[PDB]
Amino acid sequence: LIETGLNTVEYFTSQQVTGTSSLGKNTIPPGVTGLLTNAPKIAIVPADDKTVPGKPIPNPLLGLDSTPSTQTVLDLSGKTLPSGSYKGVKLAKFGKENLMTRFIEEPRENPDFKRGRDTGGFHRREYSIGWVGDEVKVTEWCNPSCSPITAAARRFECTCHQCPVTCSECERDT
């Protein structure tokens, strides 16, 4: 079953009142969409799109290069410090648990699908996830609102001419 999680502070708050953590629960964090469907809010998406230019994102596991991006490592068995970003770690779990590896999240200030020019002028946050047992890795990056959302994970360039180069989420990426 899929349920939408709860804003951190709502969790932060109520946990000081009720000793229950609320972890043990198949949830996806709010504002994130399960970008995987080849052919809650999951959203069905096309495997690829050679229509728009853009270098593909190397498999996370391969621990290769992708620089303007953030790397997250999560060990389901405890024993090792998790690393990266809150959302990275959050999705890594929800990712392992369900058979899902692609995730999208478009910020608040943005009005199915047809991304391009009409919806350009911002960045849309992508997430790629890998397995390897108990060990879960995630590569996260920024994509132009211009861009199309697909199962394939690439770093598309821009069609709109308004879509930016750095966001405030795109920084400290390497």
Partner: protein, 1132 residues
């Protein structure tokens, strides 16, 4: 490596569960209340609750059901711990001795398996054929009930439905059948199954009913008469009996969710319902007597009864009485009246039971002002919200107050030679004496033939031979009783005035300057046995007869004027036996001889508020082990009295103290009164076992509280308190708060009730424009920063924050070179659509006077979870960042450096240039501010993942952490400073399972320390979700080792309630790993040692090499350990 101690200062007060039945006797109604680890047993009666037995368990009570197998005289008790320790208990009482024996036990844990949401369900079959346990999804655990299965063997019948909401056994079923609610893709339904102990499988059951309300959450098996079940939901309450089906939808529910329920009638008819907002309902079932044969269920309705504390547990007792078990507020005893009085409520509260939980935050403060801490907390939540003031000390219940100023002394008296109670109270004044008579509760002037009233009395009372004595400055008068009059009188040979007066039942010793006169009390005559001239002006006297002697003291305690001495004198001859040269400038005020447990002492008080106490030998008269404490600053008067059994000393002064003995160690306990000039025990029929107290202006009678206890002052808020500070200069506290307001068509959001933030004196709202570029029915949180007065605790000023802005951190402090003391708040703009805040700010206020002033503002791109004053700077955490801000002369906070290696930095603590960071899941990390560099440096971190909840610094090298699985731990900076990798790590040196969820840690002590020496070092108190208050200290490897041995021995002797092993219980434990405690010692175990028989005590000590400090080993005795533990009990 690490050596810490952990003791409970306050047992959990939150009620987790409460069942009712016949446990103590088949002909007794018992009320069993579960705190967390505590089990309280009562007997229901006229007055209501009669405490019978209270015990603890080595684990958290998760399931608790009384039941009765065929063949048992009374009920048995089932209990399942959160660590899965299972057991069946029997209440067995022989004499004044009560024990809860174990009939069966075992741990029903499974190796694998996913703990279900809605948690552990533990139900018992009506036939008592078996116990059902829903511990994991897809599995249903079964435990047969043959008087054979004592190890609690059990099997797991598989369950298709992987998401059960609730479960209960049904009545009237040849075969045990389970009726539950579940949720799969198609929605929520409710089916049944039969449970065969024989085949050990689950077939198919009587009835099924798919698609009940989508919010169906509770199940209820209705008893024999009706049979079948009931399903409570959100607006949907339905009945299901196979073929039958009813369904009402009272709009009265709609508002809040019904969380708890209780059968009022043994047959169904009436049930109590619990709202999430405190509404008490009544569910009725209309029984239809067909005409001939069977009875059906015609209809059912809901009826609001009234308001109670937000209930967790609900239990009907008898004669319309109900016990409301609360988790968020005080629990209560309530009466259900037939007629709904004013406003319309059948509910009228009887008794209110304090509950400090949840405790979300706290601070130590020396309110009253003088070396005694005090805890002020943010307890409760929502409507039950409040502040609590927790102070130590002894309490007195005032029963009368008269305006008599100038009282210079007072004595109790027996007017009737025959009766044994007091009936008169003699009062002294500058130059007169006034005799009050006691009629029941009425006190009025009266005269006493033999006494003079135009002179000051120094002493008076009952003496030998049905006589009465009154000693004034002019003379000592002996008075008859039945005949009633002056039958003898003594006076100095030259009319000189008596200056000091000591006197017991048969002897008198008065002083006339330097002259001492020993007189004895005989029939109709006062006999002057002797006299002497002391080398100096006499200051104080005592001739209290100690020992098994008979009313005749062989000794005379005296305090002198010039050489500031206290000396013992042989009574007949006034021969010097010991001259203790003490103090130096001020003369002795009071001096007394007394016995505490078995030993005799001499107490002497100076005009300094200083008190000297020596061991006294009533044969030789030599004073030993000279000790000294400071009880205050005004001169101190000593007086004796007997509380219950024993006898103590009441020390009158600006800091009133009761002095007595515990385990041969004296105890100085503070009284919760202002100032007491004189005291005296008073035992009249109107004022049974009381104290007559007097200050500078008023007389007052009341009764002492047996012995010390934390007293809880409470301040309702009616909304949720979140954080709290204290600003000395402002003489007030800063408190972060939230209230529930619902959206309204009228443009915005209203509210649900008056609250501290709304009914405030001052008020204001955020005017910020930093950001500005639900339905109707939805709830919304509104935060405020209250300003409460230190003395009155009334809300001086309230301040509202921007819509949607949550305030998360508080702090009172100065900054930079700025002279003013601000109130600084960290916030977050919370939108349900975002997974984590992306905006927030740091507002800086000041309460320079009358109202609050919004001095500055600083934008932030996330939540400011924590912030702390740091060497003039302001440390704060936003989301994944830890930032240090400076405060300019232009009054702005500006970033200097940051640290970004965190997932989510929730907690912050500081000591020097070191900083302790508590993160969501990467446990603690230590940073150091490098001045010259202008930024942060990572010193070391814990490499073990831990979901934190609280954090603290025990000292430069040790850091304490509380985790979300009820565990505590300690990390230390490795000492192998020989490598930049070894220093990089901080070893987990301490592991201990608390069984308590911790929100706050804070250096402090609720215990005095100005009393003129501790086996422990440090003192960190901590708040809990259950309202439990703990303490933590540090021990030397020496003490640790002894106490660790002590534990292991004690564990062999203490009868553990469910046969649970203390070591299992205290083992660090999570869904990940499970390890044995270490570095930790619980004083609860160690302190329970003082409560067992000497035999057992001697067994615990058997063959123990003990070092009494003599460095010369010896075989340890029980008294050695008694001395040790007694010292330990004094840290709280």
């Amino acid at each position: 490596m690490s050596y810490n101690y952990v003791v409970t200062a306050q047992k959990p007060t939150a009620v987790n569960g409460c069942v009712t039945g016949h446990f103590t006797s088949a002909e007794d109604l018992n009320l069993l209340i579960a705190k967390n680890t505590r089990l309280e047993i009562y007997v229901v009666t006229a007055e209501g609750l009669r405490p019978v037995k209270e015990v603890g368990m080595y684990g958290k009570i998760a399931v608790m059901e009384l039941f009765r197998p065929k063949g048992e005289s009374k009920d048995l008790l089932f209990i399942l711990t959160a660590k899965y320790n299972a057991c069946i208990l029997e209440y067995k009482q022989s004499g004044e001795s009560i024990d809860i024996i174990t009939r069966a036990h075992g741990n029903v844990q499974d190796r694998i398996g996913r703990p279900s949401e809605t948690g552990i369900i533990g139900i018992i079959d009506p036939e008592c054929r078996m116990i059902g346990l829903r511990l994991y999804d897809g599995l249903f655990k079964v435990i047969p009930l043959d008087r054979d299965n004592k190890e609690l063997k059990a099997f797991n019948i598989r369950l298709e439905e992987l998401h059960v909401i609730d479960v209960k056994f049904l009545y009237g079923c040849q075969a045990p059948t389970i009726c539950f609610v579940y949720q799969d893709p198609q929605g929520r339904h409710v089916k049944t199954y039969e449970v065969s102990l024989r085949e050990k499988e689950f077939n198919k059951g009587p009835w099924k009913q798919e698609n009940v309300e989508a919010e169906a959450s509770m199940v209820i098996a209705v008893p024999e008469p009706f049979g079948g079940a009931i399903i409570i939901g959100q607006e949907s309450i339905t009945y299901h009996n196979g073929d039958k089906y009813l369904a009402i939808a009272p709009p009265i529910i709609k508002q809040s969710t019904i969380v708890c329920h209780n059968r009022v009638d043994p047959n169904g008819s009436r049930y109590l319902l619990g709202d999430m907002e405190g509404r008490l309902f009544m569910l009725l079932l209309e029984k239809e007597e067909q005409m001939d044969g069977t009875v059906t269920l015609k209809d059912l309705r809901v009826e609001l009864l009234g308001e109670t504390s937000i209930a967790e547990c609900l239990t009907y007792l008898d004669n319309g009485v109900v016990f409301v078990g609360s988790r968020l507020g005080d629990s209560q005893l309530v009466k259900l009246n037939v007629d709904s009085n004013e406003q319309g409520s059948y509910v009228v509260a009887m008794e209110t039971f304090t509950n400090l939980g949840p405790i979300v935050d706290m601070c130590v403060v020396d309110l009253e002002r003088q070396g005694q801490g005090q805890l002020v907390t943010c307890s409760g939540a929502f409507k039950e919200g409040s502040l609590r003031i927790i102070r130590n000390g002894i309490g007195i219940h005032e029963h009368a107050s008269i305006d008599l100023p100038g009282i210079k002394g007072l004595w109790p008296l027996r007017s009737d030679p025959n009766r044994e109670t007091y009936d008169t109270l003699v009062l002294s004044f500058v130059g007169q004496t006034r005799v009050l008579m006691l009629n029941g509760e009425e006190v009025e002037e009266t005269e006493l033939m033999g006494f003079v009233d135009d002179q000051q009395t120094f002493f008076c009372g009952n003496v030998a031979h049905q006589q009465l004595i009154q000693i004034t400055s002019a003379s000592v008068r002996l008075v008859s009783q039945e005949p009633k009059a002056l039958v003898s009188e003594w006076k100095e040979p030259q009319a000189k005035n008596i200056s000091v007066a000591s006197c017991n039942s048969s002897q008198v010793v008065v002083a006339v300057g330097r002259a001492l006169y020993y007189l004895q009390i005989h029939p109709q005559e006062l006999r002057q046995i002797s006299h002497t001239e002391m080398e100096h002006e006499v200051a104080c006297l005592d001739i209290t007869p100690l020992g098994d002697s008979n009313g005749l003291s062989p000794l005379c305690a005296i305090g002198l004027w010039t050489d500031i001495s206290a000396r013992i004198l042989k009574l007949p001859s006034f021969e010097l036996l010991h001259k203790e040269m003490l103090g130096g400038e001020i003369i002795p005020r009071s001096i007394l001889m007394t016995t505490f447990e078995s030993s005799h002492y001499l107490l002497c008080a100076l005009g300094d508020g200083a008190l000297f106490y020596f061991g006294l030998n009533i044969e030789t008269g030599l004073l030993s082990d000279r000790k000294k404490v400071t009880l205050g600053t005004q001169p101190t008067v000593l007086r004796t009295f007997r509380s219950l059994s024993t006898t103590n000393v009441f020390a009158c002064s600006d800091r009133p103290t009761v002095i007595y003995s515990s385990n041969h160690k004296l105890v100085f306990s503070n009284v919760n009164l202002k100032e007491v000039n004189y005291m005296c025990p008073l035992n009249s029929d109107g004022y049974p076992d009381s104290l007559a107290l007097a200050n500078n202006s008023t007389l007052t009678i009341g009764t002492i509280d047996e012995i010390q206890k934390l007293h809880i002052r409470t301040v309702p808020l009616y909304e949720s308190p979140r954080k709290i500070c204290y600003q000395e200069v402002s003489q007030c506290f800063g408190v972060l708060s939230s209230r529930i307001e619902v959206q309204d068509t009228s443009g915005g959001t209203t509210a649900l009730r008056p609250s501290a933030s709304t009914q405030a004196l001052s008020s204001s709202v955020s005017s910020s424009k930093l950001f500005s570029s639900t339905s109707f029915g939805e709830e919304v949180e509104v935060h405020n920063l209250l300003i409460i007065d230190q003395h009155t605790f009334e809300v001086l000023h309230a301040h509202q924050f921007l819509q949607n802005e949550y305030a998360l951190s508080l702090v009172s402090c100065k900054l930079g070179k700025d002279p003013n003391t601000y109130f600084i708040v960290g916030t977050a703009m919370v939108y349900p659509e975002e997974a984590e805040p992306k905006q927030g700010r740091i507002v800086v206020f000041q309460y320079s006077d009358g109202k609050l002033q919004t001095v500055a503002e600083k934008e932030v791109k996330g939540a400011v979870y924590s912030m702390v004053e740091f060497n003039g700077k302001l440390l704060a955490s936003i989301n994944s960042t830890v930032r240090l801000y400076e405060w300019t002369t232009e009054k702005d906070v500006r970033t200097e450096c940051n640290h970004y290696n965190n997932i989510m930095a929730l907690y912050l603590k500081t000591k020097g240039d070191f900083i302790l960071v508590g993160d969501l899941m990467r446990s603690v990390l230590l940073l150091a501010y490098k001045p010259m560099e202008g930024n942060f440096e990572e010193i070391a971190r814990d490499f073990n993942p831990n979901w934190m909840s609280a954090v603290e610094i025990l000292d430069d090298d040790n850091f304490l952490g509380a985790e979300n699985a009820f565990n505590l731990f300690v990390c230390q900076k490795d000492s192998a400073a020989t490598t930049d990798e070894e220093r990089q790590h901080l070893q987990e040196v301490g592991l201990f399972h608390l069984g308590e969820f911790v929100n706050v840690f804070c250096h402090g002590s609720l215990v005095m320390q100005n009393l003129g020496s501790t086996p422990t070092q440090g003192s960190v108190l901590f708040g809990t979700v259950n309202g439990m208050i703990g303490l933590v200290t540090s021990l030397s490897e020496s003490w640790y080792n002894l106490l660790l041995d002590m534990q292991n021995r004690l564990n062999k002797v203490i009868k553990s309630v469910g046969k649970i092993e203390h070591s299992f219980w205290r083992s660090f434990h999570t869904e990940r790993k499970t390890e044995p405690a270490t570095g930790f010692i619980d004083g609860d175990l160690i302190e329970s040692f003082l409560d067992i028989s000497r035999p057992k005590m001697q067994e615990v000590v058997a063959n123990l090499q003990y070092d009494d400090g003599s460095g010369m080993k010896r075989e340890a005795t029980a008294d050695d350990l008694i001395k040790v533990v007694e010292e330990l009990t004094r840290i709280h």
